[PDB]
Design an enzyme around this catalytic site. Structure first.
Site, PDB file in Angstrom:
ATOM      1  N   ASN A   9     -25.798  24.430  -8.358  1.00 55.68           N
ATOM      2  CA  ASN A   9     -25.545  24.148  -6.963  1.00 55.68           C
ATOM      3  C   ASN A   9     -24.038  24.008  -6.774  1.00 55.68           C
ATOM      4  OD1 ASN A   9     -28.010  22.396  -5.003  1.00 55.68           O
ATOM      5  ND2 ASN A   9     -26.323  23.673  -4.276  1.00 55.68           N
TER       6      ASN A   9
ATOM      7  N   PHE B 139     -20.510  27.522  -2.995  1.00 59.13           N
ATOM      8  CA  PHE B 139     -20.866  28.929  -2.777  1.00 59.13           C
ATOM      9  C   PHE B 139     -22.321  29.108  -2.299  1.00 59.13           C
ATOM     10  CE2 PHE B 139     -22.095  27.941  -7.105  1.00 59.13           C
ATOM     11  CZ  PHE B 139     -23.349  28.545  -7.213  1.00 59.13           C
ATOM     12  N   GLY B 140     -23.209  28.222  -2.756  1.00 56.98           N
ATOM     13  CA  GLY B 140     -24.654  28.336  -2.523  1.00 56.98           C
ATOM     14  C   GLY B 140     -25.458  27.647  -3.617  1.00 56.98           C
TER      15      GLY B 140
ATOM     16  N   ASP C  51     -11.832  35.946 -10.943  1.00 55.82           N
ATOM     17  CA  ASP C  51     -12.298  34.658 -11.482  1.00 55.82           C
ATOM     18  C   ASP C  51     -12.743  34.756 -12.952  1.00 55.82           C
ATOM     19  OD1 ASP C  51     -12.758  31.866 -11.314  1.00 55.82           O
ATOM     20  OD2 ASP C  51     -14.767  32.155 -10.491  1.00 55.82           O
TER      21      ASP C  51
HETATM   22  O1  ZRM Z   1     -22.768  33.927  -9.885  1.00 54.13           O
HETATM   23  C1  ZRM Z   1     -22.929  32.766 -10.244  1.00 54.13           C
HETATM   24  N1  ZRM Z   1     -22.276  31.664  -9.732  1.00 54.13           N
HETATM   25  C2  ZRM Z   1     -22.463  30.369 -10.161  1.00 54.13           C
HETATM   26  C3  ZRM Z   1     -23.326  30.019 -11.121  1.00 54.13           C
HETATM   27  C4  ZRM Z   1     -23.404  28.608 -11.499  1.00 54.13           C
HETATM   28  C5  ZRM Z   1     -23.155  27.626 -10.558  1.00 54.13           C
HETATM   29  C6  ZRM Z   1     -23.199  26.289 -10.892  1.00 54.13           C
HETATM   30  C7  ZRM Z   1     -23.499  25.935 -12.186  1.00 54.13           C
HETATM   31  O2  ZRM Z   1     -23.546  24.597 -12.513  1.00 54.13           O
HETATM   32  C8  ZRM Z   1     -23.756  26.896 -13.143  1.00 54.13           C
HETATM   33  C9  ZRM Z   1     -23.701  28.230 -12.795  1.00 54.13           C
HETATM   34  C10 ZRM Z   1     -24.017  31.104 -11.657  1.00 54.13           C
HETATM   35  S1  ZRM Z   1     -25.191  30.955 -12.902  1.00 54.13           S
HETATM   36  C11 ZRM Z   1     -25.466  32.659 -12.939  1.00 54.13           C
HETATM   37  C12 ZRM Z   1     -26.370  33.249 -13.888  1.00 54.13           C
HETATM   38  C13 ZRM Z   1     -26.986  32.492 -14.866  1.00 54.13           C
HETATM   39  C14 ZRM Z   1     -27.800  33.140 -15.770  1.00 54.13           C
HETATM   40  N2  ZRM Z   1     -28.045  34.458 -15.773  1.00 54.13           N
HETATM   41  C15 ZRM Z   1     -27.438  35.156 -14.806  1.00 54.13           C
HETATM   42  C16 ZRM Z   1     -26.595  34.610 -13.858  1.00 54.13           C
HETATM   43  C17 ZRM Z   1     -24.684  33.304 -12.004  1.00 54.13           C
HETATM   44  C18 ZRM Z   1     -23.861  32.415 -11.271  1.00 54.13           C
END
Ligand code: ZRM
Ligand code: ZRM
Lengths: 23, 346, 348, 22
Positions: free
Chosen positions: B29, B32-33, B144
């Site tokens: 969370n 961003f969303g 990023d």
């Molecule tokens: O695009 C992304 N933005 C942010 C996060 C995020 C945000 C807050 C946290 O505490 C941890 C991760 C994640 S986790 C994720 C993902 C995870 C596993 N397999 C594929 C994609 C993509 C993204």
């Protein structure tokens, strides 16, 4: 340092100030 | 609950279709969303669903960008769909789930007071540079790059770049925001307020990742924007007037005390592989254009062991696919192909 | 005072010819023979004449090797001729070579005396040309067997390097044994110390590695007081070899047990200001495992040499760099894909 | 003479390490 950085960039003092903070 | 939506294939086409998924739990969370993990009913395969609030009369950068991409070192967009607060629109990115990150792997070694085996440093960085070579070839800059955005499959050691929420298709002449990238990985031109920067900001961040993998900690841990430059200056010294112009032509500092660079060989622990330090020194440059391109980095002596017919992971397994280059990926320097692809791979 | 002789061109109609020269002065003596400087009457050009006591009906190895070579980074054989002493069957072979005024040895010693480290640009320039000449001779299966700073000739104006003294040189044939006590001690590869007779031209790469390290340190990296002491100096840096590395060096040598010493870190062997790419290249040259060392062509393509591929590069004396990228196909024989690195955009 | 003997007898490394610890 977001307004501080902005001020440092606008004022032309960034490197001077970073060097100071190095000591 | 089982949840059924009508969704559009990522690649695609492009004909909407019914997709059902279950076991929905939150795994993140942020501002961003939200990100969910879920299981696809038809497949069993795990997916991450990135839900974002979307301005209904605006297009989403990340979506547009994600739809273009298809590469073994980039997180795959499987599907996307919209919901429905009443009049409110969310875009949902359905991504292949990957359980580990380079962050949580490096953190595990760091807490055990030890360094990541050199071989993994070669594997992760090489796959990172490949993903950069690919996205940069469309003119997309990630903006990023950091260890948390480098997903890992712990069995295969496949690395997938993720989180394109800051990504942008860079057009020369058209200015870009300077306050971007996580602080520790932020290129100096950005700190200097550059709005005309290039994809080479990703290479800088890639250098910080490399250095971090070698030190067991971030090379430039600034407490703030200004302190971030202090940190850089401790290693690189102060930039020359010419380096300042190359970073930001609109910035002038007539008077400042000049400081010499610290030697690279003293930045890292004495047993650090000299070739890793050498590569690092060609990524962590003030002058953006003097940094290696991702393809150039892939071809570096440091990854020679990866090109050796007999290379294996410490767990006995073969390495993931390293040599399956496409014309898109090689477009910045097509001749380099005969060096990047070893004879035993053709 | 004109000396005239019937000599045969080095390359290569094979038809003998009258050759005249003047100003004959001695430039060196040693157990091999004598080297003279002289001036060709026909063109005013300076030559070195290497006079060696030679015995027919046996071939001279040096001669045969030299007649094959035509390369900008190798001292050219212009003529050769036999002469006789006066003591019945006393025959001398005379190699007429292009004269080159300086050596990498003399230039490094000059910097070392003035308490200066050799400027890194000269390190890249000298080493690159050395590897280029190595790639060239190795493509014929020729191994120099005596790479050392004294054997690298230098034009101090143009910075052209020319490899010389092919008196230890040999065309290596896999399967046919070669002598172990070869090379100058400080530059001698560890497999040679371990008594190998089945070694390859990668022994020159080790020696090249010792020249590199020496230019960075201002002195020899492995200054052994004797053959055994040479391995000692090596162990001080590389540590002891593994059982695998020993087998790679000389499969006919075994030592069951020995006290292990660990390698000294490469970054501590050199001074803090040493360019990291220089250290990196060095670490890929000074390996126990002979097949693990870079080939000369790979060495040329190492990032340490990137500055030479920059269109804007200048010598510290203001001059342009010498020809660095005029590679023939014979030079690129062992590895054509490397042309992408080796020949930069602006040079095609 | 000496190097040859240590090579043939398989005592080179042992002897070299000993000399380093003098
Ligand atoms: O695009 C992304 N933005 C942010 C996060 C995020 C945000 C807050 C946290 O505490 C941890 C991760 C994640 S986790 C994720 C993902 C995870 C596993 N397999 C594929 C994609 C993509 C993204
Ligand atoms: O092949 C050679 N062997 C030995 C020497 C030598 C002999 C006695 C010393 O004190 C030093 C070096 C030389 S000098 C040389 C040369 C010199 C200048 N231009 C072209 C060739 C070739 C060789």
């Amino acid at each position: 340092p977001h307004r501080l950085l902005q001020q440092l960039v606008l004022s032309g003092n960034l490197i001077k100030e970073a060097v100071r903070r190095l000591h | 609950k089982v949840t059924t939506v009508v969704a559009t294939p990522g690649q695609g086409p492009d004909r909407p279709q019914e997709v059902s998924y279950t076991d929905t739990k939150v795994i993140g969370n942020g501002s961003f969303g939200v990100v969910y993990q879920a299981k696809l009913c038809d497949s069993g395969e795990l997916v991450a669903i990135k839900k974002v609030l979307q301005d209904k009369r605006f297009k989403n950068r990340e979506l547009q960008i994600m739809r273009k991409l298809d590469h073994c070192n980039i997180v795959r967009l499987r599907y996307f769909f919209y919901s429905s607060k009443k009049d409110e629109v969310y875009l949902n990115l359905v991504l292949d789930y990957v359980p580990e990150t380079v962050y949580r792997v490096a953190r595990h070694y760091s807490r055990a007071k030890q360094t990541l085996p050199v071989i993994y440093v070669k594997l992760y960085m090489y796959q990172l540079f490949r993903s950069l070579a690919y996205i940069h070839s469309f003119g997309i800059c990630h903006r990023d790059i950091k260890p948390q955005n480098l997903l890992l499959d712990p069995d295969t050691a496949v690395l997938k770049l993720c989180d394109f929420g800051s990504a942008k298709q860079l057009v020369r002449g058209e200015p870009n925001v300077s306050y971007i990238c996580s602080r520790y990985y932020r290129a100096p031109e950005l700190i200097f307020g550059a709005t005309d920067y290039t994809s080479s900001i990703d290479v800088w961040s890639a250098g910080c990742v490399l250095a971090e993998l070698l030190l067991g900690q971030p090379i430039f841990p600034g407490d703030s924007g200004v302190d971030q430059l202090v940190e850089i200056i401790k290693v690189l010294g102060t930039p020359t007037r010419e380096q300042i112009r190359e970073m930001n032509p609109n910035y002038t500092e007539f008077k400042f005390p000049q400081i010499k660079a610290h030697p690279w060989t003293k930045v890292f622990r004495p047993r650090t592989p000299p070739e890793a330090i050498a590569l690092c020194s060609r990524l962590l440059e003030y002058t953006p254009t003097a940094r290696l391109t991702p393809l150039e980095a892939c071809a570096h002596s440091f990854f020679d062991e990866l090109r050796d017919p007999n290379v294996k992971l410490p767990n006995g397994r073969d390495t993931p696919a390293l040599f399956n280059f496409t014309t898109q990926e090689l477009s910045s320097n097509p001749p380099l192909a005969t060096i990047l692809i070893p004879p035993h791979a053709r």
